[PDB]
Amino acid sequence: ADLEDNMETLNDNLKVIEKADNAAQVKDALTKMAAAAADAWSATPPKLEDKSPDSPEMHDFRHGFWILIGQIHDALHLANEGKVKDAQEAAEILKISCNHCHQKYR
Amino acid sequence: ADLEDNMETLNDNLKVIEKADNAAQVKDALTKMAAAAADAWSATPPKLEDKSPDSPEMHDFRHGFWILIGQIHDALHLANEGKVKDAQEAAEILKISCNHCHQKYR
Amino acid sequence: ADLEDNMETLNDNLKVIEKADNAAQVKDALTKMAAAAADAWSATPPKLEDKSPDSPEMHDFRHGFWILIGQIHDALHLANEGKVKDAQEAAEILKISCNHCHQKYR
Amino acid sequence: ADLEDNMETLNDNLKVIEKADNAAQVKDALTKMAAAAADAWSATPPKLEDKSPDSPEMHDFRHGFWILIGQIHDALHLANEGKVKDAQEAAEILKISCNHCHQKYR
Ligand code: HEC
Ligand code: HEC
Ligand code: HEC
Ligand code: HEC
Numbered sequence: 001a002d003l004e005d006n007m008e009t010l011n012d013n014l015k016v017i018e019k020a021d022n023a024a025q026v027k028d029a030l031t032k033m034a035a036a037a038a039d040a041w042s043a044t045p046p047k048l049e050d051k052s053p054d055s056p057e058m059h060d061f062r063h064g065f066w067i068l069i070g071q072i073h074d075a076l077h078l079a080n081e082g083k084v085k086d087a088q089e090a091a092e093i094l095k096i097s098c099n100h101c102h103q104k105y106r
Numbered sequence: 107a108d109l110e111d112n113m114e115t116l117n118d119n120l121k122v123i124e125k126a127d128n129a130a131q132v133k134d135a136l137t138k139m140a141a142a143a144a145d146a147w148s149a150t151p152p153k154l155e156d157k158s159p160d161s162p163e164m165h166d167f168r169h170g171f172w173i174l175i176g177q178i179h180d181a182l183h184l185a186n187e188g189k190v191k192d193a194q195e196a197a198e199i200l201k202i203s204c205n206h207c208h209q210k211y212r
Numbered sequence: 213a214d215l216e217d218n219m220e221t222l223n224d225n226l227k228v229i230e231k232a233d234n235a236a237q238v239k240d241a242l243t244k245m246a247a248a249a250a251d252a253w254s255a256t257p258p259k260l261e262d263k264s265p266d267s268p269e270m271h272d273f274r275h276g277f278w279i280l281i282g283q284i285h286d287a288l289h290l291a292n293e294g295k296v297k298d299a300q301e302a303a304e305i306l307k308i309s310c311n312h313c314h315q316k317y318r
Numbered sequence: 319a320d321l322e323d324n325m326e327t328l329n330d331n332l333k334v335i336e337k338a339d340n341a342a343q344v345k346d347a348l349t350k351m352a353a354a355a356a357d358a359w360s361a362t363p364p365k366l367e368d369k370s371p372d373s374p375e376m377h378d379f380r381h382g383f384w385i386l387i388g389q390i391h392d393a394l395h396l397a398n399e400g401k402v403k404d405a406q407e408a409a410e411i412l413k414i415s416c417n418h419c420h421q422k423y424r
């Protein structure tokens with residue numbers, strides 16, 4: 001997918017997590033978010049179109065996806081263990097990761 | 107890229123790190139490895155073609171890529187900081203992650 | 213130090229980071245926070261005195277320190293790469309970890 | 319506990335994980351290891367006795383404990399999920415972390 005459609009997938013499943021009823025719903029939403037972030041890994045965002053893929057700025061951009069995926073990784077372990085509510089609370093932390101990359105690069 | 111091509115990229119660049127003599131070369135190889143792993147994230151390997159994408163096996167498959175990318179992540183900070191020899195030694199750990207996934211799913 | 217002492221050290225240095233210039237003020241605050249969190253690792257907080265250190269609740273308690281230390285860990289790499297602004301911005305996510313533990317166990 | 323006691327705790331419990339036939343012994347051993355590593359956090363090893371707790375060598379020393387605790391963190395999630403064989407294969411990776419610190423600072 002392109003960067004914009006992966007972002008739609010991130011947003012849709014972030015919402016699913018916040019309103020989920022059970023561990024299966026949380027795990028499915030987290031898995032979909034991680035695959036969307038991994039697929040967006042090599043995207044160049046519009047405001048960085050002039051930057052080398054080997055530059056400090058593009059490493060910072062990808063670093064934002066590493067943070068997001070790492071956060072999803074931990075939440076998914078929690079949901080695998082049945083700590084659904086703790087997994088759901090990880091959405092508050094994820095949201096900041098969204099905001100931070102958006103405020104620098106969107 | 108397909109799974110086999112991402113693996114060639116992982117293989118080529120792990121050997122680069124093992125033979126490298128400067129920080130820029132290690133950083134460049136680490137970034138290529140991470141992009142290949144992120145691109146391989148949603149691949150289904152031949153031995154899991156019968157498995158549901160939500161199966162435990164496919165989560166465990168993707169989990170091996172998270173481990174690898176996480177190791178690359180820390181090594182890339184060490185390389186960014188000048189600790190070239192430490193970043194280079196992280197290839198010994200990287201290799202164990204290669205072996206573990208291969209033993210299970212290759 | 214006891215838990216209350218380490219919490220003050222976290223609180224003071226969390227404020228130092230938000231109100232800092234230069235990698236030095238930030239690095240030094242992060243280093244002290246990591247040492248305080250590590251020293252707190254095995255503390256039994258009042259609301260869990262009836263739980264054994266093998267209980268699920270005590271694992272969930274320590275797990276909140278792992279999240280905190282992992283965030284400090286990444287912030288310190290950023291500060292050591294000269295990314296003082298990005299390091300200072302970790303303070304927002306750190307505070308969320310403070311609050312998530314407090315809401316359950318303080 | 320002093321550094322020698324925390325190292326004995328790590329050595330004993332790494333062997334427990336290797337020999338283990340059940341999840342409970344793995345989880346218990348990993349918990350003991352994490353506590354030992356957290357307690358060793360602010361130790362000064364003999365070869366750095368003359369240096370500052372703030373020295374770059376001492377940051378680099380502590381960094382080895384973060385690597386170890388992060389690896390224990392993931393293996394404990396796997397043990398908690400009943401993936402006992404996968405948690406035990408994490409011991410191979412832990413050992414390299416033991417060796418990497420010993421080669422530099424023991
Ligand atoms: C960088 C590392 C990012 C992270 C992490 C997240 N997003 Fe993002 N997103 C990013 C950019 C550069 C853009 C701009 C796209 C463009 O073509 O200019 C976006 C865009 C979105 C959108 C589109 C909405 C709009 O502004 O019209 C959405 C809905 C969105 N992003 C959601 C989202 C969520 C929920 C995230 C975290 C879970 C998230 N994004 C992370 C870069 C990055
Ligand atoms: C799972 C999570 C894996 C990780 C981590 C790594 N590899 Fe891998 N590799 C994996 C599979 C399932 C396969 C088989 C793919 C197929 O279609 O048969 C492979 C294969 C390879 C190969 C051979 C590629 C080919 O042309 O057939 C190589 C050279 C290879 N892998 C290298 C490699 C390295 C160096 C890794 C770590 C840095 C690594 N792989 C990780 C699954 C997984
Ligand atoms: C659990 C994993 C915690 C994390 C992470 C943080 N804190 Fe905490 N804090 C915790 C407990 C159980 C308590 C109660 C201690 C008691 O004996 O009652 C506290 C308390 C505090 C306090 C008040 C200390 C006092 O004098 O009573 C402060 C100022 C405080 N905590 C700050 C703080 C900050 C800034 C944190 C993040 C950087 C943080 N705590 C994390 C448990 C946990
Ligand atoms: C640095 C960050 C280290 C990590 C990670 C591990 N160890 Fe270690 N170890 C370290 C030092 C500096 C020393 C010497 C301490 C001294 O005062 O001599 C050690 C020593 C040991 C020992 C011998 C203890 C003794 O009484 O002589 C053992 C058995 C040992 N270490 C085991 C061990 C294991 C199994 C580790 C990984 C799980 C490990 N150590 C990590 C520094 C560091």
Ligand SMILES: [Zn+2]
Nearest residue numbers: 074077275395
């Ligand atoms: Zn966790």
Ligand SMILES: [Zn+2]
Nearest residue numbers: 180183289381
């Ligand atoms: Zn690190």
Ligand SMILES: [Zn+2]
Nearest residue numbers: 063183286289
């Ligand atoms: Zn980082």
Ligand SMILES: [Zn+2]
Nearest residue numbers: 077169392395
């Ligand atoms: Zn994991």
